[PDB]
Amino acid sequence: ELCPKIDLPGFDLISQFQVDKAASRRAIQRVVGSATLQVAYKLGNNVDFRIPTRNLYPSGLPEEYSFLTTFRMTGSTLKKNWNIWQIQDSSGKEQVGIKINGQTQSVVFSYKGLDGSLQTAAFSNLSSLFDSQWHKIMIGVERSSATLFVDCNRIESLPIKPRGPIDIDGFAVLGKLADNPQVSVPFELQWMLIHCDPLRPRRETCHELP
Numbered sequence: 125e126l127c128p129k130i131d132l133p134g135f136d137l138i139s140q141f142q143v144d145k146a147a148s149r150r151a152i153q154r155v156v157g158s159a160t161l162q163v164a165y166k167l168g169n170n171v172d173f174r175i176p177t178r179n180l181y182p183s184g185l186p187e188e189y190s191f192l193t194t195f196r197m198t199g200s201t202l203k204k205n206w207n208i209w210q211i212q213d214s215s216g217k218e219q220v221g222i223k224i225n226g227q228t229q230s231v232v233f234s235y236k237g238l239d240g241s242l243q244t245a246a247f248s249n250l251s252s253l254f255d256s257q258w259h260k261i262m263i264g265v266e267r268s269s270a271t272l273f274v275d276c277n278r279i280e281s282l283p284i285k286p287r288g289p290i291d292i293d294g295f296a297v298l299g300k301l302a303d304n305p306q307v308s309v310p311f312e313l314q315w316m317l318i319h320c321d322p323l324r325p326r327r328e329t330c331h332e333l334p
């Protein structure tokens with residue numbers, strides 16, 4: 125449904141979560157991004173960006189897709205474990221998500237397996253991502269693998285098990301602390317996209333990361 129066979133469509137999450145609107149309504153601050161002409165949005169601070177899961181993924185996520193985002197974090201945020209994006213059930217339990225694990229300087233892709241357990245693909249050794257500068261991370265979710273790209277460089281590919289159904293009675297939310305779904309973490313957001321083409325990250329360039 126979200127991604128029909130056939131180029132393949134993509135979804136602008138900054139648009140869907142109405143981040144731009146919130147900035148145009150003085151809810152959050154807009155700042156210069158990774159490059160002079162780029163606009164970024166400052167987050168965290170107790171703005172709640174969440175959308176009922178049923179409103180976006182009534183049938184869950186497709187088998188294959190890619191998640192791409194350009195963001196910046198600094199100070200205390202660098203040591204926190206937080207989900208830049210995730211789908212959680214009504215109680216706040218993660219169904220699928222992309223976690224920036226500052227405690228181990230790694231990025232973790234979590235997903236529900238066929239038996240309902242939460243499986244993970246942990247990409248470690250990513251110290252370069254925690255330097256307070258702008259970075260772009262992309263994850264290509266394929267049939268049996270998940271591949272991480274950082275600043276347009278292929279970093280590593282890990283095997284992943286078949287995805288099971290997810291609970292859709294919750295919400296898709298942005299920048300929430302890994303342990304507490306009610307706590308937002310401050311960070312700057314410049315781009316966030318979910319694309320139907322799992323190989324979408326391969327044709328991305330990073331000229332905007334001076």
Ligand SMILES: [Zn+2]
Nearest residue numbers: 213214291293
């Ligand atoms: Zn539930």
